[PDB]
């Protein structure tokens, strides 16, 4: 199945200190076409994806802090640092959010760039992921 996922580019001003571990301040409206028997998994792009870890990286790469793209409230997903996929199979179409992992710090920031590549997933941990749909660039400015 070809999972067409709608990932919205979200440029909005927040603090990473306001991110108190479990605080969704980047609710991405993800709509997934199909996926009837498929898991949906998110991946970060080269900007904030190092080998298999995603985080909030600054426009000037001054600070990096790991986050989790976890569903706001609708289901449970298997959290990996490289991919985020539900154990469920089917069209998910809902809202996930950026939660900072354990509230890092928030070191005097400015602009943050976390490009999120949409796609589906077809196995478990072995990285059976396929980039599909739209790549949404979540931009986290502090103001």
Tokens of 135: 């790549």
**Among 112, 75, 79, which residue's Cα sits nearest to residue 92?**
75
CB-based contacts of 123, cutoff 8 Å, min separation 6: none
- Burial per residue of 53-80, b for 16 or more beta-carbon CB atoms within 10 angstroms, e otherwise: ebbbbbeeeebebebbbbbeeeeebeeb
Method: NMR
Q: Give me the residues paired with residue 17 across strands.
A: none
User: What domains can be seen in the chain, in order of their start residue?
Assistant: 1-143 (2.60.40.1570)
CB-based contacts of 101, cutoff 8 Å, min separation 6: 21, 65, 66, 67, 68
């Amino acid at each position: 199945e070809e999972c067409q996922v709608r990932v919205g580019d979200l440029t909005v001003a927040k603090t990473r200190g306001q991110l108190t571990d479990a605080a969704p301040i980047g609710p991405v409206t993800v709509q997934a076409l199909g996926c009837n028997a498929r898991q949906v998994a998110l991946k970060a792009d080269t900007d904030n994806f190092e080998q298999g870890k995603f985080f909030l990286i600054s426009d000037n790469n001054r600070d990096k802090l790991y986050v989790n793209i976890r569903p706001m409230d609708n289901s449970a997903w298997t959290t990996d640092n490289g991919v985020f996929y539900k154990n469920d199979v089917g069209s998910w179409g809902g809202t996930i959010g950026i939660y900072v992992d354990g509230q890092q710090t928030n070191t005097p920031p400015g602009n943050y760039t976390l490009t999120l590549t949409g796609g589906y997933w077809a196995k478990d941990n072995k990285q059976g992921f396929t980039p599909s749909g739209t790549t949404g660039t979540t931009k986290l400015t502090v103001t």
